[PDB]
Amino acid sequence: AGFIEGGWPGLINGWYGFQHRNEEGTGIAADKESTQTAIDQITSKVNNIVDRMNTNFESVQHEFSEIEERINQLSKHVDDSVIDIWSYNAQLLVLLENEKTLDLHDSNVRNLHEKVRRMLKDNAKDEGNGCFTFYHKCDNECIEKVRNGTYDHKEFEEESRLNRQEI
Amino acid sequence: AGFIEGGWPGLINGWYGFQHRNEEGTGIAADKESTQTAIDQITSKVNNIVDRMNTNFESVQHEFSEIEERINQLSKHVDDSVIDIWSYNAQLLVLLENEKTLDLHDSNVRNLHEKVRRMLKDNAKDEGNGCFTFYHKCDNECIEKVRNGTYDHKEFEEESRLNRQEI
Amino acid sequence: AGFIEGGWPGLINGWYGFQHRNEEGTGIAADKESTQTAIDQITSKVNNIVDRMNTNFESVQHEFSEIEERINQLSKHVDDSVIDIWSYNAQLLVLLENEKTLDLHDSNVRNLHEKVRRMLKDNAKDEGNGCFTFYHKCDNECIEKVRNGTYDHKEFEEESRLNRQEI
Amino acid sequence: DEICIGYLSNNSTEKVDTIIESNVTVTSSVELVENEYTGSFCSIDGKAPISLGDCSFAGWILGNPMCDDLIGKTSWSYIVEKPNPINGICYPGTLENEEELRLKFSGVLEFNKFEAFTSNGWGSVNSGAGVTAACKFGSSNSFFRNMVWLIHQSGTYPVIRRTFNNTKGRDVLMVWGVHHPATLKEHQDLYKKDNSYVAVGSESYNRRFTPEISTRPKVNGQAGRMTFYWTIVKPEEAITFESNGAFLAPRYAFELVSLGNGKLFRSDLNIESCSTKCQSEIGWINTNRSFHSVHRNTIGDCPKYVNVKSLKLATGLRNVP
Amino acid sequence: DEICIGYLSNNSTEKVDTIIESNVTVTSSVELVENEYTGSFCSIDGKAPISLGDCSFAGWILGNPMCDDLIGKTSWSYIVEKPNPINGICYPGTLENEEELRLKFSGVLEFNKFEAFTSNGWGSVNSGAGVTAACKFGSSNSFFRNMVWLIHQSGTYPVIRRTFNNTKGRDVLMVWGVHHPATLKEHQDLYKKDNSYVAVGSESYNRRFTPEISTRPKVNGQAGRMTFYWTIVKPEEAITFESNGAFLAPRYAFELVSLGNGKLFRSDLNIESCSTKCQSEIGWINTNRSFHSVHRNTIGDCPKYVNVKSLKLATGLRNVP
Amino acid sequence: DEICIGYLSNNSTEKVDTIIESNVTVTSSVELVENEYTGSFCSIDGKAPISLGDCSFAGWILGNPMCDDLIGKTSWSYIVEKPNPINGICYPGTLENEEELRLKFSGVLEFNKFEAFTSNGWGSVNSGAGVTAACKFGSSNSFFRNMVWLIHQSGTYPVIRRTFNNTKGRDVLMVWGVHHPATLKEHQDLYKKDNSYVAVGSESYNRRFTPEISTRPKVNGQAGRMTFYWTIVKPEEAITFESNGAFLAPRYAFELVSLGNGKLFRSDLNIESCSTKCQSEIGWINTNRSFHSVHRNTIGDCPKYVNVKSLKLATGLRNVP
Ligand SMILES: *[C@@H]1O[C@H](CO)[C@@H](O[C@@H]2O[C@H](CO)[C@@H](O)[C@H](O)[C@H]2NC(C)=O)[C@H](O)[C@H]1NC(C)=O
Ligand SMILES: *[C@@H]1O[C@H](CO)[C@@H](O[C@@H]2O[C@H](CO)[C@@H](O)[C@H](O)[C@H]2NC(C)=O)[C@H](O)[C@H]1NC(C)=O
Ligand SMILES: *[C@@H]1O[C@H](CO)[C@@H](O[C@@H]2O[C@H](CO)[C@@H](O)[C@H](O)[C@H]2NC(C)=O)[C@H](O)[C@H]1NC(C)=O
């Protein structure tokens, strides 16, 4: 079950990670590093929208007599149209940044998928559904090396070429 | 003749589709589903820009005497700079959303290309030009299954492996 | 040493290019065409932000008596909030277009990498690090044909298939 | 045997712009902005506007005597005044706060003109002479119909005082004036005494006014001036006018019957019998589009005015054979 | 043996929008806008506001005699007036530029009321009667406390003149008035002469005022009016009042002690003993969020008001099992 | 044998921001905003501005007698006044609508001063005394040069009357005043009668002014005041001045010759002989950039002012060895 067929209820401590099946059993485990980066980025996005790019504007309304109706209507028109402007700016920025947030998550998961394909090189078949059948036994020591990005493809290069050759 | 080399005068009822050549001849046919999704999305984009994200502003211009020139200049300055603001907002939004529309179409066609690559798996050579030489006879019944996404790669897996092995 | 592992101090006359190693030696050379296009695009982006999308607003401040404090405070509130609005608009547009500039460069380099993969077709192994081991001798006449996009894959098709078959 | 993935290429010659690229041909694009308008005044929801004919706003409100075509034009979607109306404040003068009253009438859609004070009911004073060559009716000497220019009866002008008790349950617009004679003599011959006052007072209004005598140049043959004033008498308010001269006494007043979104256009253009969702100072706009750049001065259900003459918004693909 | 790459799917039912897609369920989203508020007036950083109780701004500044609960309310974070207070300018009239003075007091946070002119020190003139049924204290006839209504002593009202030397090193707000009697007789009985003046002059101020005698409709039983004036005496300015009648003479003035960002709310809501970072015209807002849509009329450290009731901002992923 | 595809890495230390990342080093970036300025007043397209030297706007328009350096400063790109000039309305007073006249002069680029009424042509009246310690020339008693303070000849001040026929085909700015003496005696000694008038009438103007006699606190040793009026006499208008006293009679007037976009800066900075495309209240700006944050109060062909001191716009790539 990979990322093309959907998300995982059961990814506990993160937004992106890996599901494996080996001989010692099955596991789901979050990717600490690609998750934290996404969180720093979305924390930047929120903090930019609610403060720093949230330039402050407070309504100043005065009183006017019955023959100051021109200045009354003008002062109220200033207040109304400037609220309308900050209100467009907030709704638009949210709408444009919502599209970008959704594209960032999509784009972050597909970057892990390719950081892992490049580590795995000739030792795993890309099943296309966002998975990898290895060409060698990948025990829990091997899996944790794929997860923490210490997987050297030379350690399993010959074993892989031999199992693959025979297919 | 694929999508990398350009678009198809002759794609009749759609924005994205398939050209095939088999033994029974050649054909162009629009992709109903990926086209309608793009249309719902662009219809959302237009409807958002011309209404809902088109917050309304009407000019309030009053008359002034020759010794109300300060108040005249101020009322006209409010009207001018607020029109200038809504006018920037519309032109900018169009400019930014034009870039995004063009990138969405480009990105939608490359998603069809990859939804088809994942169905086809090891049964077709990715020619690079956005096409696929199959490794088996794909009669009109086989093509229509690629188009409507019911193409099971097992039905032609052995035939394909046998023709490919021999190359 | 490819683009996945980072940029090249030593790319002289460009933003994107090619590093080669053959039998005659080693070289870095910028890509004239993909660099100029990126420059036309960024020049359009700057020229749009500083002029044309830089709709003009000049402050009007007049003088008021001690019993014209309402109109004084209103004229100054209009000036303050409209500068605030053009100031948000400039900083936001820069922030959103900075993100897009960085993504354009990333996206331009990966398009060269794929325009070259499609030219090279079956004659080079995609090493995954943004490089290509050829399956034939690629002399400086062959390299310059890869760089200027005139590399016909038929010229080296048999030699390549023969060296690759034997692996 | 092969299958390719593709997109649309097109007849289309239509270009759009982005921040990185200009004049990019695309398979389809909409123009968002509307630029055509017709150039007459139509009705808004089948309610016709009124022409002030050949009167200024001021001439209409004060009842310039040549502005009788206007009686019974009592409701409107909006008002059209011409840029140079011929019949203004004929007796040379000013209407105080004419511009504040012009804004009020942007909000007024129907009034009803009535007699608040009988011309004849002021006490011992001549309601009858009170006419001038400045304010002609036909070719004959008249005066503003909404006020009466009181002078001495039998060689004396007493202190006159009358009250209007507003029992209409609605805002009544009342108008009056002060005469600024050219010489003490013109003051004496009209108000058979040397110096006068006009005193106007309600539960919320309060003013004394006095003539200001001086030699001006003539305008419409008159060295005198008149300043015309207005106020809104709210329902249940009484308003008392007291005076011993230089008084242009109120006669007709206006019950403000319907309020709503109105306008006053200044233009040459003709009122035709058509409807429009949207009416601008230079003509009517009939569009399905949500932006226009015809003219900012608009009334009805209207597109957003913008500076920009064109917004080409891309719908389709880049388009390349 | 195999490894897949994936993302989170969720119980989450929360939807957000983009320009191309509405009601898109996502794994998490924040609401940026705040809409809950409490509906009383609290203190801003522990500084309480003041209620004007049952007085208008004007009644408070002039010292309407039924506004004594207000004496010694001398500092505030802001001021609450009720929309239709019962105790205004009891003797019917107006405070000139009341709106400009209202704005001043948006910027004032503390004043100190003092006696600028002794009630008794105006000369041969009665400081002692100067009371009316319009301006009751209990059931007993009174007058605005901040001014004194001088009349004749023993059948004569002399020319009275006093000066205030502003030695406070701060802006002093001074108020006075002019009486507009209903009849010459009321003028004669009070100011034992036919016509009076009030002359007020400083290094920067200069005005003569005169009664305007005329019968207005009665308000609080009075056909007469009064017009009340104010000015700021700047530090080291001297201001002279000269008059021979119709003079509501200054007594108490206000030293403008602390300036700062204040407000005047018009509302029926109650001042409670609580604190708030943020106070709106219709209640207090207690939020960690940076946008709100409670009410635009706000004081304290406040979120940006916006028209929009909700901005759902996506944090999480698209969420699809 | 192999070929790689690559991008630029750089010495560059320059950082920019996005919504998702701060302080991102890049291969190149431009600064859009300009912050350097020089701090004098230059000419705009070789047209010099003028200093009012040590005069208020008012002192300059009325011709304060110590403002003679200003005669023949008749055209400008803009005007520089010092924030507290020493030479104002020396005889203490006010210029009515001084602020609206200040706005007029924001629109005026050249005037032409001319004698509209000879000082000596007013009739049996002393044009010759009309000088005071308030309005010193050197160490000697003078008066505003643009008006003349007329007094009795041989114990009589007749009713004087003169007309100015504006035949210049352009707007003429006229100034005059009314004397508000401190005592009846000062009135008697100067205008040999108890009470005077000043009457000013044109086709459009109409005012009678009267002295208002009272002791104000002394300013420049004067208990009296003067109120100075201005009006625009439009082409073909005749304006008549009639008076029997308290009259500061018009002498010099200003033909408003060139209109255009001007300014009035208040600052102590000096006019130097340089050119600038752009001039701000605190100095000149010489930049090819399209935003600046020097000061909002700007004249000439100028960049858009913004609050933000820096906009770092990325041109290059992310830059990573
Ligand atoms: C897109 O193309 C048109 C046509 O070539 C541009 O408008 C013209 O600009 C030229 C000079 O460049 C002027 O002298 C013409 O009078 C214009 N012609 C028309 C018919 O408009 C237009 O500005 C281009 N867009 C951009 C962004 O450069
Ligand atoms: C998002 O979904 C909600 C609820 O499913 C939509 O709100 C409804 O809108 C329809 C009309 O199209 C109304 O009949 C209902 O009264 C609304 N329901 C509720 C519970 O408020 C909402 O319009 C959708 N948003 C968009 C942009 O389509
Ligand atoms: C980007 O870089 C600068 C330089 O390090 C940061 O400015 C510093 O901010 C800290 C606290 O955040 C201040 O106390 C320092 O005094 C600042 N240093 C200098 C040299 O000015 C800036 O805050 C960074 N921007 C972001 C968005 O993180």
PDB file of C-alpha atoms in Angstrom, chain A residues 2-3 5-9 11 14-23 42 49-50 54-55 58-59 62-63 79-80 83-84 86-87 90-91 94-96 98-99 101-102 105 109 112 130-134 137-138 146, chain E residues 1-10 16-20 24 26-28 30 32 99-100 102-103 263 266 290-291 296-308 310-318 320-321:
ATOM      1  CA  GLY A   2       1.931   3.176  -1.286  1.00  0.00           C
ATOM      2  CA  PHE A   3       1.118   6.999  -1.619  1.00  0.00           C
ATOM      3  CA  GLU A   5      -3.436   4.744  -3.623  1.00  0.00           C
ATOM      4  CA  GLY A   6      -3.810   7.335  -0.779  1.00  0.00           C
ATOM      5  CA  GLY A   7      -2.800   8.322   2.764  1.00  0.00           C
ATOM      6  CA  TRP A   8      -2.360   6.121   5.865  1.00  0.00           C
ATOM      7  CA  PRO A   9      -4.537   6.324   9.015  1.00  0.00           C
ATOM      8  CA  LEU A  11       1.070   7.295  10.276  1.00  0.00           C
ATOM      9  CA  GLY A  14       4.453  12.851  11.167  1.00  0.00           C
ATOM     10  CA  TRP A  15       2.979  13.937   7.786  1.00  0.00           C
ATOM     11  CA  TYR A  16       5.200  11.753   5.520  1.00  0.00           C
ATOM     12  CA  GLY A  17       6.898   8.386   6.106  1.00  0.00           C
ATOM     13  CA  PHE A  18       7.467   4.785   5.004  1.00  0.00           C
ATOM     14  CA  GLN A  19       5.445   1.496   5.237  1.00  0.00           C
ATOM     15  CA  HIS A  20       7.680  -1.667   4.936  1.00  0.00           C
ATOM     16  CA  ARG A  21       7.052  -5.441   4.778  1.00  0.00           C
ATOM     17  CA  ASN A  22      10.093  -7.729   5.391  1.00  0.00           C
ATOM     18  CA  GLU A  23      10.539 -11.184   6.966  1.00  0.00           C
ATOM     19  CA  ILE A  42       3.897  25.940   7.146  1.00  0.00           C
ATOM     20  CA  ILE A  49      -0.172  35.727   7.218  1.00  0.00           C
ATOM     21  CA  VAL A  50      -1.226  36.542  10.860  1.00  0.00           C
ATOM     22  CA  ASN A  54      -0.741  41.520   8.603  1.00  0.00           C
ATOM     23  CA  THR A  55      -0.338  45.319   8.326  1.00  0.00           C
ATOM     24  CA  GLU A  58      -7.987  50.711  12.866  1.00  0.00           C
ATOM     25  CA  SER A  59     -11.272  52.541  11.860  1.00  0.00           C
ATOM     26  CA  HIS A  62     -15.811  61.100  13.852  1.00  0.00           C
ATOM     27  CA  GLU A  63     -19.196  62.860  14.405  1.00  0.00           C
ATOM     28  CA  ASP A  79     -13.498  53.458   6.365  1.00  0.00           C
ATOM     29  CA  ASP A  80     -15.801  51.094   4.374  1.00  0.00           C
ATOM     30  CA  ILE A  83     -11.908  47.574   5.323  1.00  0.00           C
ATOM     31  CA  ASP A  84     -13.204  46.034   1.994  1.00  0.00           C
ATOM     32  CA  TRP A  86      -7.884  44.573   3.827  1.00  0.00           C
ATOM     33  CA  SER A  87     -10.764  41.964   3.751  1.00  0.00           C
ATOM     34  CA  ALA A  90      -6.873  38.470   3.689  1.00  0.00           C
ATOM     35  CA  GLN A  91      -9.370  36.196   1.818  1.00  0.00           C
ATOM     36  CA  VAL A  94      -5.617  32.574   2.240  1.00  0.00           C
ATOM     37  CA  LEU A  95      -7.124  31.211  -1.075  1.00  0.00           C
ATOM     38  CA  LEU A  96      -3.806  31.537  -2.974  1.00  0.00           C
ATOM     39  CA  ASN A  98      -4.247  27.217   0.495  1.00  0.00           C
ATOM     40  CA  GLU A  99      -3.582  26.083  -3.174  1.00  0.00           C
ATOM     41  CA  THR A 101       0.024  24.454   0.879  1.00  0.00           C
ATOM     42  CA  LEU A 102      -1.794  21.514  -0.884  1.00  0.00           C
ATOM     43  CA  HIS A 105       2.526  18.509   0.691  1.00  0.00           C
ATOM     44  CA  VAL A 109       6.008  13.424  -0.496  1.00  0.00           C
ATOM     45  CA  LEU A 112      11.063  11.745  -0.485  1.00  0.00           C
ATOM     46  CA  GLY A 130       4.973   4.736  -4.790  1.00  0.00           C
ATOM     47  CA  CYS A 131       6.503   1.429  -3.461  1.00  0.00           C
ATOM     48  CA  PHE A 132       9.778  -0.491  -3.949  1.00  0.00           C
ATOM     49  CA  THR A 133      10.208  -4.306  -4.168  1.00  0.00           C
ATOM     50  CA  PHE A 134      13.894  -4.802  -3.141  1.00  0.00           C
ATOM     51  CA  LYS A 137      16.557  -9.407   1.909  1.00  0.00           C
ATOM     52  CA  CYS A 138      15.992  -6.048   3.743  1.00  0.00           C
ATOM     53  CA  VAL A 146      16.679   3.368   4.138  1.00  0.00           C
TER      54      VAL A 146
ATOM     55  CA  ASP E   1      10.678  -7.607   0.622  1.00  0.00           C
ATOM     56  CA  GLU E   2       9.405  -4.002   0.011  1.00  0.00           C
ATOM     57  CA  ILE E   3       9.237  -0.307   1.277  1.00  0.00           C
ATOM     58  CA  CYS E   4       6.600   2.299   0.243  1.00  0.00           C
ATOM     59  CA  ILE E   5       6.506   6.124   0.677  1.00  0.00           C
ATOM     60  CA  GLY E   6       3.273   7.731   1.927  1.00  0.00           C
ATOM     61  CA  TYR E   7       1.465  10.592   3.686  1.00  0.00           C
ATOM     62  CA  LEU E   8      -1.144  11.057   6.476  1.00  0.00           C
ATOM     63  CA  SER E   9      -4.889  10.326   6.134  1.00  0.00           C
ATOM     64  CA  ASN E  10      -7.152  11.507   8.946  1.00  0.00           C
ATOM     65  CA  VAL E  16     -10.814  24.854   3.036  1.00  0.00           C
ATOM     66  CA  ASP E  17     -10.988  26.629  -0.364  1.00  0.00           C
ATOM     67  CA  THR E  18      -8.576  27.504  -3.193  1.00  0.00           C
ATOM     68  CA  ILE E  19      -9.362  29.479  -6.437  1.00  0.00           C
ATOM     69  CA  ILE E  20      -9.946  26.229  -8.459  1.00  0.00           C
ATOM     70  CA  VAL E  24     -11.545  20.442   0.031  1.00  0.00           C
ATOM     71  CA  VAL E  26      -7.677  18.480   4.730  1.00  0.00           C
ATOM     72  CA  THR E  27      -5.800  16.829   7.663  1.00  0.00           C
ATOM     73  CA  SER E  28      -5.773  20.136   9.640  1.00  0.00           C
ATOM     74  CA  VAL E  30      -6.662  26.962  11.523  1.00  0.00           C
ATOM     75  CA  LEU E  32      -7.747  32.937  11.516  1.00  0.00           C
ATOM     76  CA  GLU E  99     -18.033  67.463  17.212  1.00  0.00           C
ATOM     77  CA  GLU E 100     -14.518  68.982  17.089  1.00  0.00           C
ATOM     78  CA  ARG E 102     -15.696  65.328  20.897  1.00  0.00           C
ATOM     79  CA  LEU E 103     -12.597  64.449  18.807  1.00  0.00           C
ATOM     80  CA  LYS E 263     -12.487  56.642  22.564  1.00  0.00           C
ATOM     81  CA  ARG E 266     -22.190  55.325  22.197  1.00  0.00           C
ATOM     82  CA  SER E 290      -4.832  38.259  14.626  1.00  0.00           C
ATOM     83  CA  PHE E 291      -8.115  38.854  12.686  1.00  0.00           C
ATOM     84  CA  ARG E 296     -14.726  47.731  13.576  1.00  0.00           C
ATOM     85  CA  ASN E 297     -14.941  50.291  16.416  1.00  0.00           C
ATOM     86  CA  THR E 298     -12.203  48.909  18.699  1.00  0.00           C
ATOM     87  CA  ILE E 299      -9.706  50.145  21.390  1.00  0.00           C
ATOM     88  CA  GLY E 300      -6.648  48.398  22.933  1.00  0.00           C
ATOM     89  CA  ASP E 301      -4.184  45.912  21.366  1.00  0.00           C
ATOM     90  CA  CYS E 302      -6.646  44.420  18.808  1.00  0.00           C
ATOM     91  CA  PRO E 303      -6.810  42.007  15.902  1.00  0.00           C
ATOM     92  CA  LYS E 304      -7.388  43.573  12.391  1.00  0.00           C
ATOM     93  CA  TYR E 305     -11.165  43.826  11.770  1.00  0.00           C
ATOM     94  CA  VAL E 306     -12.354  42.227   8.465  1.00  0.00           C
ATOM     95  CA  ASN E 307     -15.772  41.913   6.701  1.00  0.00           C
ATOM     96  CA  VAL E 308     -15.293  38.128   6.267  1.00  0.00           C
ATOM     97  CA  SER E 310     -14.308  33.029   8.405  1.00  0.00           C
ATOM     98  CA  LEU E 311     -10.821  32.505   6.910  1.00  0.00           C
ATOM     99  CA  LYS E 312     -10.062  28.721   6.969  1.00  0.00           C
ATOM    100  CA  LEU E 313      -6.275  28.510   6.251  1.00  0.00           C
ATOM    101  CA  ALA E 314      -4.915  25.030   5.289  1.00  0.00           C
ATOM    102  CA  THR E 315      -1.947  23.655   7.322  1.00  0.00           C
ATOM    103  CA  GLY E 316      -2.272  19.855   6.555  1.00  0.00           C
ATOM    104  CA  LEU E 317      -2.534  17.601   3.436  1.00  0.00           C
ATOM    105  CA  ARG E 318      -5.488  16.835   1.137  1.00  0.00           C
ATOM    106  CA  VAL E 320      -7.961  10.781   0.993  1.00  0.00           C
ATOM    107  CA  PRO E 321      -8.234   7.075   2.094  1.00  0.00           C
TER     108      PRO E 321
END
